[PDB]
């Protein structure tokens, strides 16, 4: 109980990753808690509902369907209960699931994917360690 989820998105993710898209949501509903959208991108609550339910119930599904966020399709490169990574051209996507939260961000074309992965996975590890 300090600060807000928008601080996390605006400070912990967007200040360390050059993002087209970032979101934190409820892992159970998909209810969006904070977000960032660049230019003409938008995160449907339905995109996140399905993402949230797929990562928790059947993460292998992303390998079949791909990943749908910001109104665009990303190719899945790996998927499990806690971590899903994706590609769309020169843009990377990293999605993490904690005990209560879903984190997601995607990168401006050409931005290093390891840096996004590190930022999202380490923030997820911090939250998970706090039982969030």
């Amino acid at each position: 109980g300090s600060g807000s989820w928008q601080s996390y998105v605006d400070n912990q993710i967007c200040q360390h990753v050059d993002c087209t898209l970032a979101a934190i949501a409820n892992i159970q509903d998909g209810s969006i808690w904070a977000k960032f959208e660049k230019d003409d991108k938008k995160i449907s609550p339905k995109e996140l509902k399905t993402i949230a339910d797929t990562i928790r119930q059947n993460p292998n599904g992303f390998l079949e369907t791909g990943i749908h966020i910001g109104g665009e399709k990303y190719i899945c490169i790996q998927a499990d209960n806690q971590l899903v990574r994706g590609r769309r051209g020169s843009s990377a996507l990293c999605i993490v699931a904690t005990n209560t939260c879903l984190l997601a961000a995607a990168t401006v074309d050409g931005y290093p994917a390891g840096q996004l992965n590190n930022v999202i996975e380490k923030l997820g590890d911090y939250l998970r360690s706090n039982n969030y």
Partner: peptide, 12 residues
């Protein structure tokens, strides 16, 4: 609606 459940203090 209510605020969502509050985040923990930011990481280092």
């Amino acid at each position: 609606p209510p605020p969502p459940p509050p985040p923990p203090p930011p990481p280092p």
